Amino acid sequence: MRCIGMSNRDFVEGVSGGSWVDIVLEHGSCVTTMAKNKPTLDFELIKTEAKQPATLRKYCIEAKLTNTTTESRCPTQGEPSLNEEQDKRFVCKHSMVDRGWGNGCDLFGKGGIVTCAMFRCKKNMEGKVVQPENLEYTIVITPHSGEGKEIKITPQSSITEAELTGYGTVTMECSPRTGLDFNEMVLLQMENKAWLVHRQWFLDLPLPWLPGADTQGSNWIQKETLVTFKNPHAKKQDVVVLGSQEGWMHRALTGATEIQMSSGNLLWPGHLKCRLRMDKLQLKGMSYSMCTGKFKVVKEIAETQHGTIVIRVQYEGDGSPCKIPFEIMDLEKRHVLGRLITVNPIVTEKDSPVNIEAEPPFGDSYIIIGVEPGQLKLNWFKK
Amino acid sequence: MRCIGMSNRDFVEGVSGGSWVDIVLEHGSCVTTMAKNKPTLDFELIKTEAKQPATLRKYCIEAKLTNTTTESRCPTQGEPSLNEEQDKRFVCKHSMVDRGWGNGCDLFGKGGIVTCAMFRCKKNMEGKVVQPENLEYTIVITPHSGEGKEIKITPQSSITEAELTGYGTVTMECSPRTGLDFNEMVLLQMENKAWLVHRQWFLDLPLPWLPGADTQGSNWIQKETLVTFKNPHAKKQDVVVLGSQEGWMHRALTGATEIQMSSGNLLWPGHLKCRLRMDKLQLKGMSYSMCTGKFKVVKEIAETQHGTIVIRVQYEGDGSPCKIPFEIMDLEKRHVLGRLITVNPIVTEKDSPVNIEAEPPFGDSYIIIGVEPGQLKLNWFKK
Ligand SMILES: *[C@@H]1O[C@H](CO)[C@@H](O)[C@H](O)[C@H]1NC(C)=O
Numbered sequence: 001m002r003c004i005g006m007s008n009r010d011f012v013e014g015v016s017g018g019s020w021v022d023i024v025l026e027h028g029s030c031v032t033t034m035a036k037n038k039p040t041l042d043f044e045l046i047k048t049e050a051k052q053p054a055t056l057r058k059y060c061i062e063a064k065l066t067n068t069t070t071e072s073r074c075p076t077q078g079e080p081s082l083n084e085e086q087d088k089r090f091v092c093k094h095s096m097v098d099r100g101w102g103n104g105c106d107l108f109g110k111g112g113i114v115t116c117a118m119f120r121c122k123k124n125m126e127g128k129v130v131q132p133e134n135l136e137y138t139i140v141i142t143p144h145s146g147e148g149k150e151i152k153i154t155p156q157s158s159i160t161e162a163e164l165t166g167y168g169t170v171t172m173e174c175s176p177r178t179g180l181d182f183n184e185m186v187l188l189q190m191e192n193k194a195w196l197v198h199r200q201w202f203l204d205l206p207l208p209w210l211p212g213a214d215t216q217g218s219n220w221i222q223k224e225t226l227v228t229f230k231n232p233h234a235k236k237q238d239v240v241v242l243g244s245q246e247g248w249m250h251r252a253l254t255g256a257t258e259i260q261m262s263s264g265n266l267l268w269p270g271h272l273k274c275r276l277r278m279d280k281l282q283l284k285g286m287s288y289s290m291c292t293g294k295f296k297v298v299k300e301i302a303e304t305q306h307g308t309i310v311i312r313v314q315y316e317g318d319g320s321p322c323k324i325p326f327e328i329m330d331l332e333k334r335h336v337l338g339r340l341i342t343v344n345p346i347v348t349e350k351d352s353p354v355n356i357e358a359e360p361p362f363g364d365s366y367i368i369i370g371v372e373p374g375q376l377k378l379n380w381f382k383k
Numbered sequence: 384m385r386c387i388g389m390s391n392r393d394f395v396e397g398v399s400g401g402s403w404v405d406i407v408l409e410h411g412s413c414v415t416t417m418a419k420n421k422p423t424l425d426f427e428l429i430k431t432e433a434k435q436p437a438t439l440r441k442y443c444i445e446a447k448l449t450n451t452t453t454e455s456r457c458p459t460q461g462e463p464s465l466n467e468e469q470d471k472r473f474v475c476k477h478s479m480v481d482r483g484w485g486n487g488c489d490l491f492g493k494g495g496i497v498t499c500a501m502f503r504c505k506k507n508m509e510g511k512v513v514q515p516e517n518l519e520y521t522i523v524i525t526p527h528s529g530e531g532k533e534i535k536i537t538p539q540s541s542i543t544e545a546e547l548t549g550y551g552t553v554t555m556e557c558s559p560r561t562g563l564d565f566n567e568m569v570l571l572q573m574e575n576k577a578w579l580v581h582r583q584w585f586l587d588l589p590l591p592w593l594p595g596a597d598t599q600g601s602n603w604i605q606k607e608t609l610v611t612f613k614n615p616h617a618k619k620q621d622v623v624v625l626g627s628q629e630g631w632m633h634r635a636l637t638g639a640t641e642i643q644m645s646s647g648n649l650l651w652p653g654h655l656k657c658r659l660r661m662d663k664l665q666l667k668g669m670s671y672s673m674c675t676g677k678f679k680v681v682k683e684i685a686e687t688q689h690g691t692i693v694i695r696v697q698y699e700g701d702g703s704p705c706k707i708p709f710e711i712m713d714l715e716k717r718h719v720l721g722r723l724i725t726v727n728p729i730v731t732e733k734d735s736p737v738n739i740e741a742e743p744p745f746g747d748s749y750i751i752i753g754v755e756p757g758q759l760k761l762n763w764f765k766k
């Protein structure tokens with residue numbers, strides 16, 4: 001479930017001296033709002049989507065060499081230039097070797113030689129500069145009824161409305177924060193994890209890179225960082241790559257800042273500070289008859305991780321949509337004790353199970369739910 | 384070809400005041416020995432094989448995780464221990480999550496959870512301590528005839544003999560050197576290249592390692608260096624590797640000392656200082672008649688990279704195995720000028736081509752090869 005049973009959930013209650021109550025919404029946390037005559041709402045931040053990030057530079061971390069050619073000459077015959085020297089998709093190397101009889105040349109001496117190989121990247125990571133203003137926050141408002149409404153907000157339109165399903169409307173004004181010095185900070189993505197590193201530290205990485213505005217994927221820059229030519233023997237210099245740089249990147253990003261994922265969705269850390277105005281909220285119910293008084297416990301008392309207690313029951317009896325007779329009594333039945341979180345428990349159908357939550361006082365307490373013809377008298381010992 | 388036309392070739396001549404001449408044999412270099420009445424020999428170091436190296440430790444650089452299991456519990460139900468915790472081939476992780484209704488548990492609160500995954504290494508490098516005394520050096524001695532004898536030496540048996548094919552025998556005494564502080568130095572092998580690194584720097588590498596005496600390949604030590612558990616959500620913590628560490632190793636070994644290969648054979652740098660005693664060497668020939676005097680130039684004059692000049696000719700004429708009339712004359716035919724490198728050029732067969740090498744003086748010189756009935760009078764301009 002949500003909110004109830006979430007270790008990171010804060011309660012808040014609007015005073016009777018006005019409205020405009022402040023809440024703090026963060027990812028993985030729920031906020032519970034309530035007041036007298038006002039319905040209880042649950043606010044939760046779902047995802048923080050940073051749409052339209054600007055690709056800054058693309059580095060290659062795993063490449064492969066194919067189409068390796070080699071051409072040699074004899075002493076006093078000129079250098080052996082290859083056509084692949086005029087191709088940015090290739091990397092070449094010149095050298096000189098000893099030439100004479102046993103290798104089939106004119107005379108003795110230093111003969112030139114050239115070896116080229118096609119550079120083709122296989123796996124490559126990316127880096128993007130992210131804009132702070134065009135961020136998007138998804139918030140879910142749920143009426144705490146026990147039987148959600150989404151809203152997208154952005155720093156360029158912090159004011160919004162919320163047409164709840166039969167509960168009225170509530171006004172929101174949020175102000176955000178999500179990091180540190182975003183303009184000169186780059187989100188690095190390895191197509192498996194994500195980090196937030198410095199701009200200068202990212203721009204000067206010793207790897208074959210391509211500019212942001214690029215779709216070629218073959219005219220890289222500084223390919224020699226992943227390509228080394230071995231010592232030439234008879235002819236071919238035996239060019240060789242340097243394997244994969246995935247582990248080097250995973251190890252070099254230790255002192256960075258990683259961002260988890262929810263299968264695609266980036267979990268951006270940060271908190272929204274929001275003002276809520278609930279003066280235009282109505283309670284779904286009120287004008288309802290009382291139920292006949294038969295209730296069967298689907299499952300009885302169970303305290304949450306925030307002092308509040310919850311019971312799930314079913315109406316079963318017939319009496320239309322009606323209000324649940326619910327009272328919190330002493331060890332006897334003197335006065336009413338704890339308050340109610342799920343304000344005005346209603347019933348949509350006799351077969352639909354309904355949960356209810358409330359905060360009891362210390363020690364022994366009674367819960368009277370249902371009229372006498374089938375009254376549920378559930379005792380418990382809080383704390 | 385060899386020796387002739389090798390840019391790293393040194394000449395040496397034994398004086399008439401005894402024998403025991405010193406030479407320096409290194410990989411990729413040839414030594415030319417000669418003297419009056421003594422045949423010319425070519426010494427070359429082929430391979431430096433360090434047989435029987437002692438494996439010290441085996442590190443893994445590319446692993447993969449399979450057989451991932453996960454088990455959870457409810458609050459006040461105990462921790463969920465898995466059977467894979469008692470298996471060194473697995474890596475596990477404990478955690479606690481929020482549990483209540485929507486995830487099917489008893490009540491609310493912190494419920495334990497455990498996730499394990501089988502650690503299986505795919506590609507792994509090795510490190511070996513190498514012994515200096517049990518080194519093996521392969522030397523090739525070739526009689527400079529123009530138409531080789533191998534010997535294996537070790538520091539534990541530096542004295543040897545050389546039964547040349549019809550030239551007598553020569554005595555050798557070599558003393559070696561090949562590096563720096565071998566006892567606390569480890570040869571690192573990645574099954575593609577080889578380095579020589581420090582012992583302490585190698586023993587403390589942050590990678591899953593196994594002791595030297597090991598054939599298991601699955602009960603590694605410190606596997607968590609290549610395994611990280613992501614944040615748990617509903618149940619599985621989503622364990623993930625760190626890719627491949629091949630690039631990290633290839634980059635970290637920059638300030639080391641690399642060793643090239645000749646397809647399997649390690650090219651150990653170093654020089655052997657050898658004493659040669661050639662007093663028991665005879666010249667294959669001497670008691671031979673002179674040829675009739677017909678020679679056709681297979682290919683004429685061509686100077687090497689060490690001042691010496693070479694011509695390849697064929698006998699063609701009939702006259703049994705005979706000695707070649709060969710003289711170096713002035714611009715006229717006054718006196719004999721340059722000496723001869725291929726001492727006493729013989730002939731095995733009239734159809735077998737034969738090379739000849741000699742050093743001429745400055746400027747113009749004549750080469751008289753063959754008796755007058757078909758005499759070859761080849762002029763050239765050295766320097
Ligand atoms: C590389 O070699 C393959 C196989 O011969 C060939 O199909 C391909 O066209 C070559 N590419 C280049 C750029 O030469």
Ligand SMILES: *[C@@H]1O[C@H](CO)[C@@H](O)[C@H](O)[C@H]1NC(C)=O
Nearest residue numbers: 449450451452467470472501
């Ligand atoms: C891992 O899973 C495969 C596929 O189910 C199975 O064949 C293998 O026996 C499993 N290994 C272990 C150690 O559980």
